[PDB]
């Protein structure tokens, strides 16, 4: 299926049964379905913690750089994960969310100290 | 802002003024009778004309008519059609109209003096070289199929009668009237395709040239129509 126009995009594909999501960063077209066919599987991600408590994620740096140099747009969630990793700049929306959470926590502590 | 208004003035002198035209139903028939009948029914239709306008037209002209019908949507009936013929004289003078709609060819015979009709309108005013257009039945439907809500084509107030020089294609030979004969003296149709040299050579057999050379059957009209104009002008003055 040759999609008119469109553009390659490395994004998140969903797997696993219900109540057990497992994400897969994978190169695909913009018009591609969610779990539709892809071109190359790059890495994977478990949003759930392991027995150690940490969460799992894998990145294929060489192939990712290859696909970027070939040209491909990206998705905000996985780009946020990349910025968290450190191979990529940190996300401005991440900064704003962190600042909002910290302001809200300060407000909650203020309200607690006021009630007490 | 208000909109501008159109203005047009083209004044080539010996074109604009046209003078005369009489209605084809005022004149009587060759038959014998006292002109008292004629003048009384004429003044009747004239004091009716003082109300109703009968916008002047000709055969082949497109007329749109509105009439007060007892059983109709709004008790009114509106019909558009081309002029086939104007038949009869006096109050009983009528005109035939025809139109093709939904693939069906319908036609009406209108009394132009019955109070049942409300008013007349000329969507187009033209003249066909043929005096009678009864062959439009056998003609193709594409010639008769006309639009009902087409706007009135604007016509100059004082100009000559436009005569369209054309000819018409027709349905195949199995006709009802045998229009090909020379008795009708018609020219809108096209022999070259409607038939062959053999058929026209065989049909011109019934040709009788002496009809137009005869001079005792013709009906002079000069003094008659003069009196007609005189009395209609008298009725208009009074």
């Amino acid at each position: 299926k040759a999609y008119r126009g469109g553009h390659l995009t490395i994004r998140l594909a969903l797997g696993g049964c219900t109540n057990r999501p497992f994400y897969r960063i994978v190169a695909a077209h913009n018009k591609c379905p969610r779990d539709g066919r892809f071109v190359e599987q790059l890495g994977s991600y478990d949003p759930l913690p392991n027995s150690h408590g940490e969460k799992l994620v894998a990145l294929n740096l060489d192939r990712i750089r290859h696909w970027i140099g070939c040209g491909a747009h990206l998705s905000k969630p996985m780009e946020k994960l990349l910025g968290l990793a450190g191979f990529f700049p940190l996300h401005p929306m991440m900064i704003t969310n962190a600042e909002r959470l910290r302001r809200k926590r300060a407000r909650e502590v203020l309200l607690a100290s006021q009630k007490t | 802002q208000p909109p501008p208004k159109p203005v047009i003035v083209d004044k080539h002198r010996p074109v604009e003024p046209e003078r005369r035209f009489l209605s084809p139903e005022f004149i009587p028939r060759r038959g014998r009778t006292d002109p008292l009948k004629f003048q009384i029914e004429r003044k009747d239709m004239l004091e009716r004309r003082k109300v109703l306008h009968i916008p002047e037209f000709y055969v082949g002209s497109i007329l749109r008519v509105t009439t007060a019908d007892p059983y109709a949507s709004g008790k009114i009936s509106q019909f558009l059609g081309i002029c086939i013929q104007r038949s009869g004289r006096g109050l009983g003078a009528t005109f035939i109209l025809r139109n093709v709609i939904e693939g069906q060819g319908v036609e009406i015979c209108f009394e132009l003096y019955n109070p049942r009709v409300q008013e007349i309108q000329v969507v187009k005013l033209e003249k066909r070289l043929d005096d009678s257009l009864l062959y439009l039945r056998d003609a193709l439907p594409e010639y008769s199929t006309f639009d009902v809500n087409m706007k009135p084509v604007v016509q100059e107030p004082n100009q000559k009668v436009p005569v369209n020089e054309l000819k018409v294609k027709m349905k195949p030979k199995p006709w009802s009237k045998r229009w090909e004969r020379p008795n009708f003296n018609i020219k809108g149709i096209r022999f070259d395709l409607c038939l062959t040299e053999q058929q026209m050579k065989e049909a011109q057999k019934w040709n009788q040239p002496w009809l137009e050379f005869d001079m005792m059957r013709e009906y002079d009209t000069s003094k008659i129509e003069a009196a007609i104009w005189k009395e209609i002008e008298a009725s208009k003055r009074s």
Binding site: G86, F87, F88 | -
Partner: protein
């Protein structure tokens, strides 16, 4: 193989028909100011432009009040001059109004432009002509109005990658890696676009 002709037939027929009787620019740009909806579309306008469409007029409506639609006359991008204190304008070169328009309040016109005194040597096309955000500057105060006057480190993971690579290569290279940022001309959002590249209904 069986060909098919009616496909191309209808295709080219529609091409000709739509390109012939396409809706007029003025017709589809018309707006009813009390309902704030474009006719022929039934769509509503953005809340940020509601007030500007209610109050302010269009570019051709401004240019209809002076001869030749003011060749060289100063119209400035209201949005550019509200987003930046610097003056920004349009060296309008060519103009063509729409004949079907009643007030001649629509059309196409463009030329050279300038953004914060960054004049371009290209008589290219305007963007967003139909908006009600057009402001005409008179022939006075015009010179006074138009008067106008390193690098970043790599990410931590990437610089560590390069460190390991060059350490394997064998060189010390205590220098920290950097990139060009002065080369990268970060362009603001309001940089104009290509009217011909963007389509039309």
């Amino acid at each position: 193989v069986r060909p098919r002709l009616i496909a191309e037939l209808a295709r080219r027929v529609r091409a000709l028909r739509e390109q012939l009787n396409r809706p007029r620019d003025s017709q589809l740009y018309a707006v009813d100011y009390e309902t704030l909806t474009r006719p022929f579309s039934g769509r509503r306008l953005p809340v940020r432009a509601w007030a500007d469409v209610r109050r302010e007029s269009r570019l051709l409506q401004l240019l209809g009040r002076l001869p030749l639609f003011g060749l060289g006359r100063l119209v400035t991008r209201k949005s550019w001059l509200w987003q930046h204190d610097e003056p920004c304008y349009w060296r309008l070169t060519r103009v063509r109004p729409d004949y079907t328009a009643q007030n001649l309040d629509h059309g196409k016109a463009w030329g050279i432009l300038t953004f914060k005194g960054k004049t371009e040597s290209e008589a290219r096309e305007i963007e967003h002509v139909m908006y009600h955000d057009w402001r005409l500057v008179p022939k006075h105060e015009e010179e006074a109005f138009t008067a106008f006057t390193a690098s970043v480190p790599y990410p931590p993971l990437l610089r560590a990658m390069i460190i390991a690579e060059r350490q394997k290569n064998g060189d010390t290279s205590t220098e920290e890696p950097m990139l060009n940022v002065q080369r990268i001309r970060m362009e603001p959002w309001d940089y104009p676009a290509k009217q011909e590249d963007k389509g039309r209904a």
